[PDB]
Design a protein around this ligand. Structure first.
Ligand SMILES: Cc1ccc(NS(=O)(=O)c2ccc(CNC(=O)c3n[nH]c4ccccc34)c(Cl)c2)c(C(=O)O)c1
Length: 92
């Protein structure tokens, strides 16, 4: 019984996509998780992140109080723009 928080910086120069899908909503009163990891993606290459892991922060953006649409939109814009990508996730 512990909380494991890992920071993973992805090789975005080699892989042009995260290859992940996010599920859930942190929007409602009272989180956002990795639904699935796609092969050929940066997240699959790193191997540390697994499905059911809670997504806390990407780069300088925090996913708290975010709807699924908004959360997907943040990720689209970050992947679209050139640069490195760093995820903070809480292991299930
Ligand atoms: C959640 C998310 C959002 C954006 C992402 N990057 S991306 O903007 O460059 C992106 C966006 C969209 C796709 C493919 N399109 C869809 O997956 C897609 N397009 N419309 C959809 C509706 C429901 C579920 C999926 C989709 C790809 Cl292959 C890559 C990524 C990613 O790079 O893994 C993940």
């Amino acid at each position: 019984m512990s909380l494991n928080i890992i920071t993973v910086t992805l090789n975005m120069e080699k892989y042009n996509f995260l290859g992940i899908s996010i599920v859930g909503q942190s929007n409602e009163r009272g989180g956002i998780y990795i639904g699935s990891i796609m092969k050929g993606g940066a997240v699959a290459a790193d191997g540390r992140i697994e499905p059911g892991d809670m997504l806390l922060q990407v780069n300088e953006i925090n996913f708290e109080n975010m709807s699924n649409d908004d959360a997907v939109r943040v990720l689209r814009e970050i992947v679209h723009k050139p640069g490195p990508i760093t995820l903070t996730v809480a292991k299930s």
